[PDB]
């Protein structure tokens, strides 16, 4: 599955990966800058903590950057 990955926000082919994911979460700058954004790939949709939002999809290059 080919997914967008950071910091390059470019498409990359992930062996053994089945899902693209966009993971957003606040750091110390969430109030000034915005919610940290991480683009990646995984074999299963990652389990996240409470304040961390995640969006998983199965298409190729389906985790672009908002």
């Amino acid at each position, epitope marked *: 599955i080919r997914c967008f990955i950071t*910091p390059d926000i470019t498409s990359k082919d992930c062996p053994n990966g089945h899902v693209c994911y966009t993971k*957003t979460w606040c750091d110390a*700058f969430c109030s000034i*800058r915005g*919610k*940290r954004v*991480d683009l990646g790939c995984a074999a299963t949709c990652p389990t996240v903590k409470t304040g961390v939002d995640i969006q998983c999809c199965s298409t190729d290059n389906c985790n672009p950057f908002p």
Partner: nanobody
């Protein structure tokens, strides 16, 4: 969030050699650049060496051929080999690291600094 911790400084005679190491830990996701600067009494934090990912190392022409910067990215560390030390090289050396990260509003770079380690030559 980001900790730079240094080590390797000390006292040496003219012509001796040292090896400083700076370890980065924490939210080093997107670590993008790392450098060693010096500061002696009365000086500013002056450039000694720097290495930006996917760029060639840059040195100050006062240390070319004598110092050597290197980055181990699996360990997330930067090291400075200081050969043929001379008295003018005496100062507190700091390691800075520039980390780059994406937010909903865009990609920002931030500079974090190290505790600083003494290097004396006499």
């Amino acid at each position: 969030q980001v900790q730079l911790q240094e080590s390797g400084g000390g006292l040496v005679q003219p012509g001796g050699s040292l090896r400083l190491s700076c370890a980065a830990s924490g939210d080093i996701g997107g670590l993008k650049q790392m450098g060693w600067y010096r500061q002696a009494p009365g000086h500013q934090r002056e450039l000694v060496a720097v290495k930006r990912n996917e760029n060639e190392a840059n040195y100050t022409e006062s240390v070319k051929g004598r110092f050597t910067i290197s980055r181990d990215n699996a360990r997330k560390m930067v090291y400075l080999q200081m050969n043929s030390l001379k008295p003018e090289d005496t100062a507190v050396y700091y390691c800075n690291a520039v980390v780059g990260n994406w937010y909903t509003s865009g990609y920002y770079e931030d500079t974090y600094w190290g505790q600083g380690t003494q290097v004396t030559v006499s």
